[PDB]
Structures are given as C-alpha cells and as structure tokens.
Amino acid sequence: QRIGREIRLTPRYRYFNFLPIMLVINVINLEEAIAQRTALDVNETQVTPAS
Amino acid sequence: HEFAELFYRTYIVTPDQAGFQLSIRRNLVWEGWTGEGLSGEKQEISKRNILQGLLDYTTLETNSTELIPVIQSGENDEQFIDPSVLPAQTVKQGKDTFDTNFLKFSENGEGFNLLMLAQTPSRLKKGSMTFTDSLDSRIALKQLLISVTKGGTTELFALDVNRDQYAAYTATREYNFRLMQLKFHTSLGLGEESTTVAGAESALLKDLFDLGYRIELDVKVDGEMNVENGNGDTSLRALRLARVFDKEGKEIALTDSRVSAALSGLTVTGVGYSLEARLTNINQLEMGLLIDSDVQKQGFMIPTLPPLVIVKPAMVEDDKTYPRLEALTTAYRIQQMRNNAVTTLLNRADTLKSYLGVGVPHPIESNLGLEGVGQYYVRPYYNEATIDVLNDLNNLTSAAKQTDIQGLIVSKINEMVYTADQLTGYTAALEAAFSGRSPKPHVAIGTDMRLPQYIQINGDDRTVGIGYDYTIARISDLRMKDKIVMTFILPNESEPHPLQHGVLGFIPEYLVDFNMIRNQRIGREIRLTPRYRYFNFLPIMLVINVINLEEAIAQRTALDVNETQVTPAS
Amino acid sequence: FSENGEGFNLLMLAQTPSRLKKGSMTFTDSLDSRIALKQLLISVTKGGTTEL
C-alpha cells in the first residue's frame, strides 16, 4: 500500500592483503602519566632578592 | 587588528535587508518510530545524524542479504550437526532472532538446498518463495570445525578459513551454465596461540605447544554449488596429521619419539562447515537502511547602535577646516570593533562554561540554548585548565627557566588541543564537509602581550602543531590579562559556514549632514549610526588561566647565593 | 485546548476503519497545505447554567 520511486546504491568492493608483515604498538595509562604533570608536590621558593 | 577578524571572518551584507538568513541540510538514518499512541500521544521518529558514524561503527550497519542457516525442529535436523557436540548459537540479522549451527559434511552423498536453510523469519512474513532469487558469484567457507579428540576429550577449533584464497568458489562451467566449483586443498596450522571456541587455550595439543611446536594438517575438501537452483553439496575427502615444525622452522618427522607419543591415537575429524552466500538482489527483496533529509534554518539579524557626534560651526564649509572625518573613523574603529569583540568573546566563553560543564562532551545535537549551527555537525565540548607557574616548576639558578616555562605552556596547550579534538571529532567533520579539498584544521591562539614568549619553543619550526596550522595574535585589553583562548577556525573560506567560528555581520552606514539646533545654538552635527554584530557558531573553546607567573619570574632574581671563589688549578 | 504539556497527533487520531486495511501509517502520508480552524466552541455561563 504505497507508490514511491526508489533510488538504490549496490556497492561491489572488498579489501585484500598481501604482505604477511604488520607491527602493532599498544599503549595504556598515558592519561595517568599526563595527569602526573599536575599531580606534583609543590616546590615554592620565595626569599628576599640578593644582589 | 588581526585578532578581531582572526576569530570572526568579516562578511559584508547588502543594506537592503535586516540580516542574513541561513539554511543547513541534515542527513539522518532511520531506525523506526517508537510508539503508537492510541491515546493520541505524540510519535518520536528515532533519528540520528549520519556524521555520528564518523566516530562510531555501529549506528549504521547492514546485514540483510547474507544467507545464514536457520535451525528448525522437525524440518531440517538431519541437515545440521549433532547439537550435543556444539549447542545452538544466537545470531542477529535485521530484526529476527534465531539460532544457527554448522553444516555437517554430507558423506551420505545427498546434498543440501542452500536457499532453504537460510530463509529468515522476515522472509516468512515477506512470503514463502525462494526460486526467483540468484546467489552472487562470491561463495566461500567461513569456518572449518575440526574435532581434536584423544581418549574421549573433544576440543573445537573455530578456524577462519575465509582468509585462505583456496577457499573461494571458482566457476568451472562443465556441467551447466551456472555451476561453480570449490577446491580447498592445502594445509592449515594450529599454532601455540590457537584458542578454542569458548576462548580457552588448547589442552590436547598443550604438550606440544608448551614445547613450542606447531601442528599443521592437510585439508582436502571438495564441493559444488549452483546459483540458479540452489542445489549443491560439499563433502570431506581427505584429512590427516601432516607434519611438525620447530621454532627454527625446521621440519620434525612424525615418527620422532618426542612427537609420536603425543600424536599417536590423536584423531582429527571434520564436523561441520558454513558458507558465505549473498543474493544478487536482482529481484528487490530487501530494503537497506533508510536515510532522509530534513532542513533546519535560522535567521541572523543586525542591530543598530548608539551614534557618535561632532560639533562644528555651521556658517561655512564642512570640508577643509576644523575637525575632519579621520577623528570619526578612528573613534569608530577603536570603539565599535575592538571593545565589543573582546566583550563578546569573553561572554561566549563564560556562557559555554555555564551551560556545558567542563570535560563532559555531549552527543551530536544537544541543548539548543547555545547559539551556533556547528552543534548539528560536531560534538559540543568545553574544557578549562589552570596552570600554576610557580608550583609546577622548581628551578633556582637562572639559565633555562624561560625554556622550562615554554615547556610547561606547550605541554598544556598541546594536550588540551589534542584531547579536545579526540572528544569532538572535528577533523572527521571537516574532511566530510568538503570534497576535493581538505585543509589541515587550523588552531587560533590569541592572548595578551606578555605570554607569546612561551608559546613557541626554541629550536624548531613546529611549535604548537604537529598536524595543525596556527596563528598567534596579540590583544591589548586588560581583561585578557595573562590568559589564553583557543578554538578552531578556517582561513580559506570567507562566507558563513557551519564549521566557521563566527561571523562579523557588517552593514555600512553613510554619515548624514543636515541642519541642527541644539540648546538654542546653530551648530553642525556630523553623525554616523554604526551597525554591526558578532555571531557565534562553534560551541568549542579552550581556556588557560596563568597565575603566579610574576612570582616565578621574580624567582629568577630571588635565587640564593651560589658562589665558589676557588684558587686556579691546572 | 492544549495545556502546559501534551499536544495531539492528528494523523493516527484520525484513523478510520477504512484506513485500517492500508496499515497504520506510512511515510507517504502528508497533510495538505491549507489548514483552518473549522469551529470554535465557547460557553456563556451565568450562575452555573451553560449555553454553547
């Protein structure tokens, strides 16, 4: 119970691979290290200037 | 200056209209409408933006033409493997839930009709017919289920065979004009990291695997398939233990005592196999995901502002004597552009902070109470961090203190920009917006006079950007003291665009000359009513508050005495 | 008359028995350009006696 025009896209594609070579790096906890930038213990120095 | 237009690209509009009207297009993907209200209550058509698919992989997925076996009690049990060996598996395609399981090697020689086993409940509702359809030219096995048994212990290996090129059906038109052939004749290896279907490691081959050996078996499987009829059969022909490898890739014979004991009595049996079949869909049986276009539009209007006045004697020429027009233009330029620009920038920053919160992104489309149109394209995100110059750093002897300050500032700015980019997905939206061009996203960093000594680090040309382009501007207002503002801009374009930061709505006004009486005087009033407006688009901003910087700078001259007057020695 | 919340969904509110044979609703059902208020009903009441 409908009359409508249809426009269709029927793709024909795929990915193939040849090299049996691949190297992967997995990094974790980078956020903690970057947050350590602001997690340091205060080291203030404020004395009368000397000259 | 440069700072003003750097964040608000000036756009001139004809003085015939009260502003400029903006229309945008949206591409949304349809799932279904949630709820029919027989009480008359509204319907909500669940729509999501397509560019949301830039950051996810799931919200638009299609599986509606794969031919997947469906288990039926009392109708196709004899065509499936024994459920005792492997229970039913749950698989979702479309909106139907059903159970599927692997197809046993038909050594009895009676085949299967693939178009039967894979008729989905949607097709049952759709009707009952599988004979005008046609299978695509691509057919290949998903997995070979080989049973490693020894003394009564059974292990199942779900081996993805689809990634060996000999598992692909090839056309050999030698019986009929639509048959294709399968000949997967090679060796598959079970390595030390081979995992069972349940996910556990191997147990029967654990003895060899802990000794780092690799076991590979020769697989000789044959079959046929017809696209037009759906008739076909595939039966196991030859499977057997083949050879053994060591770490160094040196073959170890099957008769060797170190492996013969662990390989004698080990029977490898082929249980089931599955196929990859797709309908050519020449007959229009399935409707994929439906996507629709709806248009959102907003109107942007320009105000009029309080005027500026020159008093002037009236009896003579207004041209060559007494205060001229450059006074007017200087007052206009200094007042109406700069001050309102910085006021608008600060107000927008605080407004985004107020409505959006810090560090919490919102999905594509959000609260509409924020001006702009990029919210229809990108994820809103606001974040602010306060760097404490004095506390974060500790250096006594002046030398690299300024270098260390640059290190601090660059660290903060880079991390903020990149984390914001990841949580917004700005670059994906940018590359999707333009076809044929895709400039690297440009980051604008404008601040007061003092800080640019730390924005760039010594010794390089890549200062604040590794994959970005940047422009550093300076402003002189006291409000922008020791603070940094960051957002994204696009230099090449000069017209309103959903990805642009903001537009300076400008309408030129002519100055008027007339006759005026003021407090019973006859004077000349040269008048100009300015009209301009600043509009906001991108709900993304990054703010840095630099405090205690003066104390750290003073720490350069606040170091304690470090002197060693020792006698020369050589 | 609509209160603070709640409106009306005229489409399926106007579902007639004949339209049931065509399914609940489609994506090809659109309203005409001309929409008008057909009748306003108001009440004149004195002391609780109501005339419309």
Contact B522, B314 (CB under 8 A): yes
3 state DSSP class of B1: coil
Q: Six-digit token pair at B94?
A: 């479309």
Among B41, B44, B125, B293, which would you mutate to test the C interface (most chain C Cβ atoms within 10 Å of its Cβ)?
Answer: B41
Beta strands in B277-380 (DSSP E): 290-301, 308-313
Which residue, among B274, B277, B167, B276, has the nearest Cα to B227 in the 3D structure? B277
CB contact under 8 A, B42 and C13: no
Q: Is A26 on the interface with B (CB under 8 A)?
A: no
What count of CB pairs under 8 Å joins B to C? 15
Cβ neighbours of A12 in B, within 8 Å: none
3 state DSSP class of B259: helix
Report phi then psi at B72, rounded to 5.
-140, 125
Answer positive or negative: Cα dihedral of B202, B203, B209, B210: positive
Q: Nearest-CA distance from C18 to chain B in Å?
A: 17
Residue labelled with tokens 């409408």? B33
Count CB neighbours of B224 within 10 A. Answer: 17
Q: Which residues contact B8 (CB under 8 A, 6 or more apart)?
A: B341, B501, B502, B503, B504, B534, B535
Q: Six-digit token pair at B258?
A: 């170190």
Contact B279, B65 (CB under 8 A): yes
Contact B399, B21 (CB under 8 A): no
Answer positive or negative: Cα dihedral of A17, A19, A25, A26: positive
Interatomic CA distance for residues B305 and B473, integer angstroms? 28
Q: Which residues contact B273 (CB under 8 A, 6 or more apart)?
A: B102, B103, B105, B141, B142, B143, B144, B145, B221, B234
Q: How many helices (H) and strands (E) does chain A have?
A: 1, 0
Q: Is B289 on the interface with A (CB under 8 A)?
A: no
Interatomic CA distance for residues B223 and B235, integer angstroms? 6
**DSSP at B206:** H
Neighbours of chain A (3+ CB pairs under 8 A): B, C
Q: Is B164 on the interface with A (CB under 8 A)?
A: no
CB contact under 8 A, B391 and A47: no
Distances from the Cα of B88 to the Cα of B70, B80, B335, B530, angstroms:
10, 10, 76, 76
- Count of residues making up chain B: 570
Q: Six-digit token pair at B296?
A: 């959102």
Contact B460, B453 (CB under 8 A): no
Answer positive or negative: Cα dihedral of B89, B93, B97, B102: negative
CB contact under 8 A, B415 and A34: yes
Q: Is A36 on the interface with B (CB under 8 A)?
A: no
Experimental technique for the deposited model: cryo-EM
C19, closest residue in chain A (CA to CA): A1
Q: Which residues contact B338 (CB under 8 A, 6 or more apart)?
A: B1, B4, B477
